[PDB]
Amino acid sequence: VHLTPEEKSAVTALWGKVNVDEVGGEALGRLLVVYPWTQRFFESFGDLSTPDAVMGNPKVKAHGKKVLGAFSDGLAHLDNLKGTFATLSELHCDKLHVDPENFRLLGNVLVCVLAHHFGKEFTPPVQAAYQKVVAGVANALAHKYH
Amino acid sequence: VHLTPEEKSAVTALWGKVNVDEVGGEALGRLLVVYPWTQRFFESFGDLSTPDAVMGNPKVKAHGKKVLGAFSDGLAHLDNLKGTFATLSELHCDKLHVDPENFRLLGNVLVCVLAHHFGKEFTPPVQAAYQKVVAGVANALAHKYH
Amino acid sequence: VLSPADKTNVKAAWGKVGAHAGEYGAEALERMFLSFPTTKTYFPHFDLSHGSAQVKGHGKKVADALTNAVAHVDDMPNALSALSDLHAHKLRVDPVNFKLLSHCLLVTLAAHLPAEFTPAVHASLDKFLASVSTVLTSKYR
Amino acid sequence: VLSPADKTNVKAAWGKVGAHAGEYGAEALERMFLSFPTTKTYFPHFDLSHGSAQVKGHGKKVADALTNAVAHVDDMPNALSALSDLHAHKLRVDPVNFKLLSHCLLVTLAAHLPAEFTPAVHASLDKFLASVSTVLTSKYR
Ligand code: HEM
Ligand code: HEM
Numbered sequence A, B: 001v002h003l004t005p006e007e008k009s010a011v012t013a014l015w016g017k018v019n020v021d022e023v024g025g026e027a028l029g030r031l032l033v034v035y036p037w038t039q040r041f042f043e044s045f046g047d048l049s050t051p052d053a054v055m056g057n058p059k060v061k062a063h064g065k066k067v068l069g070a071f072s073d074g075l076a077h078l079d080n081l082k083g084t085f086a087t088l089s090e091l092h093c094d095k096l097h098v099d100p101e102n103f104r105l106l107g108n109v110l111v112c113v114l115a116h117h118f119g120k121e122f123t124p125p126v127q128a129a130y131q132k133v134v135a136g137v138a139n140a141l142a143h144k145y146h
Numbered sequence C, D: 001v002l003s004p005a006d007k008t009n010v011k012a013a014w015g016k017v018g019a020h021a022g023e024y025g026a027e028a029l030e031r032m033f034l035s036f037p038t039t040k041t042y043f044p045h046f047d048l049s050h051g052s053a054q055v056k057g058h059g060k061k062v063a064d065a066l067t068n069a070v071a072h073v074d075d076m077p078n079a080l081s082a083l084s085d086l087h088a089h090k091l092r093v094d095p096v097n098f099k100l101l102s103h104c105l106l107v108t109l110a111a112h113l114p115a116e117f118t119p120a121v122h123a124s125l126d127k128f129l130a131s132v133s134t135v136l137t138s139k140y141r
């Protein structure tokens, strides 16, 4: 992905303020609520039966934190997303058989959560920059399909 | 872009009987009929205003012949689909900006057309082999998006 | 959204299925399981071997539900409520799989009813199966 | 298919837009145009620079159409027929672009209405926008 130097600064500034304890769990939680079939991948996570149960589920929060860490690692390696995500792509494609459309949904849910947390600070240009990132991550996670 | 040896033999045997002058125009015509937003990519082609107009349009038949030639090229190089379609990928992705879901749709329309012409001869094993071909073509045409 | 011509086309083509409903249903299931093997994991306790009596019986259930949907083409959310309960609430079927089965139903229909499977009827059958899939994958209670 | 709860979630959340209709609709379009440049090719006759008066006035028409759809959530094909004729028959917009604008509308609502944008309300708004998108992209007359 190519961010301009202006986009890179704006992305990095905003990401440095991200609540790493909550943002990832909120994105994964919303994925499971808004796209309920994605819950089939998380049978061992316990109670996913209502939205309040999904969002408060400690296994969802803990796993969402790992997701956010994967995005942080991508942000720190925008010049080689395929290499940074090769292991995860093997996991998500060959083992879990996640349909790649779901990779894009989660990336866009993350965008909604950033919008939700940062309000007017999540300007249209900031979003455009982040849309390049999440598309880059989703593509890299899908690589072992390609 | 990876069929079993048996799947390759099945696709090759069937494709030898395919009417190279007709099937492409039928598949392109049905794409334009079943998924009518695709007509927007073919403004210069003339009357596309009704199913009969689409299916009878000589520019549709002629272009469909070129499409099917490209599928034949892929079927003759099943282990190198990415290289076979690289130039078309630049055209469809960089230049025309066709959303890759439309590649998948045309692939499945072609499968319906094969089913339509061959009937019971288009057995479930033969279909499954062809689903791998058209998925591989769609993936290859989308390579410049990856 | 189905046009009047869509409803006319679906009713006439599906009417021609008739006594072959279970046969075409089972064929479409077997085409799906073989072409898209991931779809088998929604049926972990089924006998999915070729020609299995279980898949035969299930194809008849699918085909009969589609017949019911055709008869209630203007009332599908009410008519298909129990099937939405099953597929959306309990099984939580990923909508991509409904596209796969819908495509395999079209393939089955085109293989068996060539005279009927015109471009216009093809288009109408696709929209109808998309409409059915939307109902079955949505939680509307 | 919208549940009774989907409809009341959408009515409560969209009802908070109020006099911000043009602002929020404009912002959603601006987000779409900047994030997904290919969407601009449907508006070649438009001034699409930022703060463009044409984009702002168009943003208002989009918002007001959504307000009308919220009010006709039980007969959207009837109420949205004119817009379907424009987007499906005449413009032939690829359905993917409706997903992009729908996403940008959600982002705008999340950014301006954090108290409204709960997980359940997010899910209802997504289904609502998908249903609007289906009407505007289907040829049903
Ligand atoms: C698109 C961006 C995504 C990112 C960055 C991401 C990131 C991650 C990471 C870091 C892990 C942990 C890997 C490990 O523990 O070895 C993981 C596991 C997992 N992911 Fe994702 N993921 C994404 C999309 C998805 C989607 C869309 C689904 C399903 C709808 C999914 C299903 C799973 C499952 C089932 C696991 C294993 C959970 C377990 O331990 O039981 N992933 N992912
Ligand atoms: C998925 C398999 C596809 C194959 C194998 C294929 C193949 C081709 C070929 C061989 C050409 C002629 C290129 C040349 O002579 O330079 C072409 C052109 C074109 N394709 Fe496709 N294509 C596919 C999918 C699509 C789809 C899905 C769309 C749009 C919905 C599309 C839109 C076009 C357009 C607009 C042109 C140029 C037509 C013109 O001359 O104006 N293609 N394609």
Ligand code: HEM
Pocket (backbone or CB within 6 Å): C039, C042, C043, C061, C062, C065, C066, C083, C086, C087, C091, C093, C097, C098, C099, C101, C102, C129, C132, C133, C136
């Ligand atoms: C046109 C689309 C579909 C129709 C009309 C349909 C209809 C039906 C019907 C009538 C039943 C039996 C319900 C009962 O016994 O009470 C059923 C069960 C089931 N369906 Fe579907 N279905 C469709 C799509 C799908 C898809 C795409 C999948 C997954 C890939 C799926 C997975 C299942 C499963 C797992 C069951 C339960 C089987 C069992 O354990 O007894 N369905 N469906």
Ligand code: HEM
Pocket (backbone or CB within 6 Å): D039, D042, D043, D061, D062, D065, D066, D083, D086, D087, D091, D093, D097, D098, D099, D101, D102, D129, D132, D133, D136
């Ligand atoms: C929720 C989805 C949408 C809604 C509610 C909506 C609503 C509207 C409305 C109210 C108009 C003005 C009609 C009039 O008063 O004459 C319009 C026009 C238009 N729409 Fe949309 N629209 C949507 C999605 C889209 C998308 C996704 C695209 C393309 C990316 C698009 C492209 C256009 C264009 C090109 C015009 C004509 C502008 C002009 O020349 O005046 N629409 N739409």
Ligand SMILES: *Cc1ccc([C@@H]2CCCCO2)o1
Pocket (backbone or CB within 6 Å): C001, C002, C073, C076, C077, C127, C130, C131, C132, C134, C135, D001, D134, D138
């Ligand atoms: C064109 C279209 C897509 C979905 C529908 C609805 C779904 C719910 C009720 C019956 O048709 O129409």
Ligand SMILES: *Cc1ccc([C@@H]2CCCCO2)o1
Pocket (backbone or CB within 6 Å): C001, C134, C138, D001, D002, D076, D077, D127, D130, D131, D132, D134, D135
């Ligand atoms: C849940 C859902 C998706 C599409 C719809 C329909 C579309 C036609 C108009 C009414 O809502 O519902």
